[PDB]
Amino acid sequence: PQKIEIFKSLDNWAEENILVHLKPVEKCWQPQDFLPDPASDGFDEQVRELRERAKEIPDDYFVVLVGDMIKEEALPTYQTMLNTLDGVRDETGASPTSWAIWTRAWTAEENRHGDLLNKYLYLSGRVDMRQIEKTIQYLIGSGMDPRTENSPYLGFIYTSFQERATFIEHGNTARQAKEHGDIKLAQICGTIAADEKRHETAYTKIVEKLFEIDPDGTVLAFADMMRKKISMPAHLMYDGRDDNLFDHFSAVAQRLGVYTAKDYADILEFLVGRWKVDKLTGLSAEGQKAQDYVCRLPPRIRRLAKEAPTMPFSWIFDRQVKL
Amino acid sequence: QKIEIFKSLDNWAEENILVHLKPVEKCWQPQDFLPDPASDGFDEQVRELRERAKEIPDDYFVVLVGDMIKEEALPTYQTMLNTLDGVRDETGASPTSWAIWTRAWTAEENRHGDLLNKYLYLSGRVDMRQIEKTIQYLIGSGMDPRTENSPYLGFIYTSFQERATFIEHGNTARQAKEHGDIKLAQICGTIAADEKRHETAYTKIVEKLFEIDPDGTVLAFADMMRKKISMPAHLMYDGRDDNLFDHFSAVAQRLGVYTAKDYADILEFLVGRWKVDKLTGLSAEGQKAQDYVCRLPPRIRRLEERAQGRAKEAPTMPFSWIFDRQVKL
Ligand SMILES: [Fe+2]
Ligand SMILES: [Fe+2]
Ligand SMILES: [Fe+2]
Ligand SMILES: [Fe+2]
């Protein structure tokens, strides 16, 4: 109960330092901004142009984009996760605490990412939305356990890591969409990436305050979380066909450079820096041991070739792409 | 106490509740009811959809949109379920029956919003920007059903809510035939069919609760009706209309998609389905609760017959969901 009551005092602090990173709803983009306008005369031409540009984008890029989209559409899970955490749990479903307001507003923001990408993929005609839709249903039913243990310390370190990861992913899919000739798609991934950046900023800011107030508790938390490993939110991906769907998806994302094990370590190196775990002093014997583990981890991961096989993906009608 | 009751019923739930989920491989997917973007007939299928959509009036669309928005607010309803004391998913992937249900239920409901969303998108008859914005408000806004962490209140509530969506989606299916669109009718009907399974499961839980603890469960049922069943989309807002929910509910009332009659008919059904009617050996409080509940449905029907008698013009009203075009209230 002492790590829990910490969060009720920070309620007002959160209003001023965290909630400021949400975009007010009137100022928020909506999927429709980046999609063929079904109320205009140019609808049919906009859709024809989209599908025409989509033919020039290779299947492997689509496999990765799809995977990222699925990850997004599993949103209910991530709101639930947030409400497992002890100081921030929405008690009623419309609680007026800062932490609850964030949780709901963050959710409302992330909801547009899936919506936009879903329609884009639908219109493209380059993927099987039936199998994608089924994958999503498995994923939501499946849930996800990040092993944050109801601890806001673990939880917000986790979300911090996750937000930066999606920032990198969406960022790279934006880059490669330009490279394949589709700037409208590049815009979609870029705008989404920009949202994730605001979320990263807010979540890293919470952990910064936690490192200020309770540095011992927060390095130990940070050590615990890396010891367990950061479990990815879509690790339980399943399409009813491939038992190793996540690994096969991750492998295409690795090859294309959308998300690599390098990017994993780079994120951890960033978070060590951003929280100045590096220069933390006056810790318990445990706290110091945790500090070491954390700081030495990124080079140790980075330390740890060729023609890969082709693999069919039900998301693209079992057509094959390299791994 | 009321919490430990649910950890015993874990195994019972596996056999009597989880059986009402459709296995994922046997589930329809929005793509089944939509133009296939991978076929050559895509452009024709879309042209046909939009052509049929022109013959559907604006007022039906206002109601369909409102129901679609209600659906797309799904994250909220999963959260609600996880506020309840005996059923809360502790980890986010808890293997308890109640948690498996919560997630699977959510996964099922998700296809309802997806499907309707793309339909409305393709129709070209609505402003998806304002709809999208309304949804963002709605999710940020949350919803408090005043179930108080009680699974007794909670599942009574969901039971009521599931039957309501069954009726709504059901009626929008009927009226889509009447306006010439069977493919839309099919969409609403397939969704309605899912809600029916959910209703059945939720009513089944409360039935067991009325068996084990009849005193606790009538009191819960009275509590919930005394408060009134607060609708999940009551906080609807598009950044323009401060009375958006009432104005939406009014069009749905006029069109007969959901009326105060249907409210009472639901309550009369649930009184019957749970046999609150023939419950015996209750506390003095339990008996008072039993009375209130059973006398309520005719009351409501009386008060509505009177309300219809003194109706205050009902103007036309603009809706941002249809580019501020106007429809009667
Ligand atoms: Fe996202
Ligand atoms: Fe994000
Ligand atoms: Fe539904
Ligand atoms: Fe339902």
UniProtKB/Swiss-Prot annotation, chain A:
<dbReference type="GO" id="GO:0009507">
    <property type="term" value="C:chloroplast"/>
</dbReference>
<dbReference type="GO" id="GO:0006633">
    <property type="term" value="P:fatty acid biosynthetic process"/>
</dbReference>
<comment type="pathway">
    <text>Lipid metabolism; fatty acid metabolism.</text>
</comment>
<feature type="binding site">
    <location>
        <position position="113"/>
    </location>
    <ligand>
        <name>Fe cation 1</name>
    </ligand>
</feature>
<feature type="binding site">
    <location>
        <position position="199"/>
    </location>
    <ligand>
        <name>Fe cation 2</name>
    </ligand>
</feature>
<dbReference type="GO" id="GO:0046872">
    <property type="term" value="F:metal ion binding"/>
</dbReference>
<dbReference type="GO" id="GO:0045300">
    <property type="term" value="F:stearoyl-[ACP] desaturase activity"/>
</dbReference>
<keyword id="KW-0276">Fatty acid metabolism</keyword>
<feature type="binding site">
    <location>
        <position position="72"/>
    </location>
    <ligand>
        <name>Fe cation 1</name>
    </ligand>
</feature>
<protein>
    <recommendedName>
        <fullName>Stearoyl-[acyl-carrier-protein] 9-desaturase, chloroplastic</fullName>
        <ecNumber>1.14.19.2</ecNumber>
    </recommendedName>
</protein>
<keyword id="KW-0479">Metal-binding</keyword>
<comment type="subunit">
    <text>Homodimer.</text>
</comment>
<keyword id="KW-0444">Lipid biosynthesis</keyword>
<comment type="function">
    <text>Converts stearoyl-ACP to oleoyl-ACP by introduction of a cis double bond between carbons 9 and 10 of the acyl chain.</text>
</comment>
<feature type="binding site">
    <location>
        <position position="110"/>
    </location>
    <ligand>
        <name>Fe cation 1</name>
    </ligand>
</feature>
<keyword id="KW-0809">Transit peptide</keyword>
<feature type="binding site">
    <location>
        <position position="196"/>
    </location>
    <ligand>
        <name>Fe cation 1</name>
    </ligand>
</feature>
<feature type="binding site">
    <location>
        <position position="196"/>
    </location>
    <ligand>
        <name>Fe cation 2</name>
    </ligand>
</feature>
<keyword id="KW-0934">Plastid</keyword>
<feature type="binding site">
    <location>
        <position position="163"/>
    </location>
    <ligand>
        <name>Fe cation 2</name>
    </ligand>
</feature>
<keyword id="KW-0560">Oxidoreductase</keyword>
<keyword id="KW-0408">Iron</keyword>
From Swiss-Prot, chain B:
<feature type="binding site">
    <location>
        <position position="195"/>
    </location>
    <ligand>
        <name>Fe cation 1</name>
    </ligand>
</feature>
<feature type="binding site">
    <location>
        <position position="112"/>
    </location>
    <ligand>
        <name>Fe cation 1</name>
    </ligand>
</feature>
<keyword id="KW-0150">Chloroplast</keyword>
<comment type="similarity">
    <text>Belongs to the fatty acid desaturase type 2 family.</text>
</comment>
<dbReference type="GO" id="GO:0045300">
    <property type="term" value="F:stearoyl-[ACP] desaturase activity"/>
</dbReference>
<feature type="binding site">
    <location>
        <position position="195"/>
    </location>
    <ligand>
        <name>Fe cation 2</name>
    </ligand>
</feature>
<feature type="binding site">
    <location>
        <position position="109"/>
    </location>
    <ligand>
        <name>Fe cation 2</name>
    </ligand>
</feature>
<keyword id="KW-0444">Lipid biosynthesis</keyword>
<keyword id="KW-0560">Oxidoreductase</keyword>
<comment type="subunit">
    <text>Homodimer.</text>
</comment>
<feature type="binding site">
    <location>
        <position position="198"/>
    </location>
    <ligand>
        <name>Fe cation 2</name>
    </ligand>
</feature>
<keyword id="KW-0275">Fatty acid biosynthesis</keyword>
<keyword id="KW-0408">Iron</keyword>
<feature type="binding site">
    <location>
        <position position="162"/>
    </location>
    <ligand>
        <name>Fe cation 2</name>
    </ligand>
</feature>
<keyword id="KW-0276">Fatty acid metabolism</keyword>
<keyword id="KW-0443">Lipid metabolism</keyword>
<dbReference type="GO" id="GO:0006633">
    <property type="term" value="P:fatty acid biosynthetic process"/>
</dbReference>
<keyword id="KW-0934">Plastid</keyword>
<dbReference type="GO" id="GO:0046872">
    <property type="term" value="F:metal ion binding"/>
</dbReference>
<feature type="binding site">
    <location>
        <position position="109"/>
    </location>
    <ligand>
        <name>Fe cation 1</name>
    </ligand>
</feature>
<protein>
    <recommendedName>
        <fullName>Stearoyl-[acyl-carrier-protein] 9-desaturase, chloroplastic</fullName>
        <ecNumber>1.14.19.2</ecNumber>
    </recommendedName>
</protein>
<keyword id="KW-0479">Metal-binding</keyword>
